[PDB]
Amino acid sequence: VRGVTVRMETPEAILFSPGETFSTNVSIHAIAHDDQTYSMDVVWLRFDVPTSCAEMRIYESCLYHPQLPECLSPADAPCAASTWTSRLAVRSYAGCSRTNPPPRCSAEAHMEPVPGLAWQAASVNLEFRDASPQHSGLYLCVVYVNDHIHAWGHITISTAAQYRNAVVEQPLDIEGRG
Amino acid sequence: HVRGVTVRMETPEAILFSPGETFSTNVSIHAIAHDDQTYSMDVVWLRFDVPTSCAEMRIYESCLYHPQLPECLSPADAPCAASTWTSRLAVRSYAGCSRTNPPPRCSAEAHMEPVPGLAWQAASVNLEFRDASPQHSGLYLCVVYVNDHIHAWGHITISTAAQYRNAVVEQPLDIEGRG
């Protein structure tokens, strides 16, 4: 029993109307099992969801290795979230530990310039002020601990008309089912 | 770097049943080995009594990782807390697992407590209840260990409507320092 455990909770969708102001409601808890220090990076990724797509496919395995060939050029081509170039936002923490919990170890933070996009100080939730159809899409919140993904989740933030179900393409389960 | 094993679990938080019904849990568990290291895995089911006088059950999340700590062995929340255990309802063990010899294939042992109407869903981690009765009502936790360390866990309150009590997860403050 060592390392860190990260648990994330959040609804898989947020339907909004044009002109509405809202915030994501992601809950993230970090449990340090030893007295080792650790770094943490909470990263937001955004993906366009084409009208022609019946659903958006998230290549789970690709999240850990977004530089792989099959990830850079997803077979489901237009309807797949398997890699990224720019990160919508990133909140970094350094020197975290059992006695110096995440809030206190806050270090740096970055956010891409997007109309109406913002976040509270020391917060990882995203706020959309005066939202519009331009903001609709698939958003992933990925939590790294010591540069390795420890937890992740997806939220389809969209107007009802633009909404498309997000499906997680994962490897076979422990029962060998796909 | 990217190493070790990642376990993801999904399941509804409650199953309401009427006496005499036959049903099964529907837990989904995926394991992703990021390297070629060999590992062991244990899928453990824990069952907790839910007293009629409890307003709600409280799960001490941090305690699941160290069930032998004093505050976990003697939970402050009367008999309405899930924070430690002795007997394990069921355990499916896997050995010699790896990226190329994934879980189903590395299945090794399976154990289950003798309980009227309870059975291991053949080749599955789910629990099946036949001719379910009030005796089966309670708070169930499914915990997945990898190399003897919890990598994922979930809870399911399985019971009749009359015996049902909401289960709340008591967690430390979040990364924003708000709990």
Numbering used by the authors:
A (entry chain B): 219 to 396
B (entry chain A): 218 to 396
From the study:
Differences between the pIgR and CgE Ig V folds include the positions of the CDR loops, the predicted Fc-binding sites (described for CgE below), the overall size, with CgE being larger due to its extended strands C, C′, and C′′, and the third β-sheet in CgE, which is absent in pIgR domain 1. However, the structures of CgE and a gE-gI/Fc complex reported here can be used to identify which insertions are likely to disrupt the CgE structure and which insertions are likely to affect function. The structural effects of insertions after gE positions 277 and 291 are difficult to interpret due to their location near disulfide bonds in the third β-sheet of CgE.
Herpes simplex virus type-1 expresses a heterodimeric Fc receptor, gE-gI, on the surfaces of virions and infected cells that binds the Fc region of host immunoglobulin G and is implicated in the cell-to-cell spread of virus. gE-gI binds immunoglobulin G at the basic pH of the cell surface and releases it at the acidic pH of lysosomes, consistent with a role in facilitating the degradation of antiviral antibodies. HSV-1 gE-gI is a heterodimer composed of two type I membrane glycoproteins: gE, a 530-residue protein including a ˜401-residue extracellular region followed by a predicted single transmembrane helix and a ˜106-residue C-terminal cytoplasmic tail; and gI, a 370-residue protein including a ˜248-residue extracellular portion followed by a predicted single transmembrane helix, and a ˜94-residue C-terminal cytoplasmic tail. Here we report the structures of CgE, an Fc-binding fragment of the HSV-1 Fc receptor gE-gI, and a gE-gI complex with Fc.
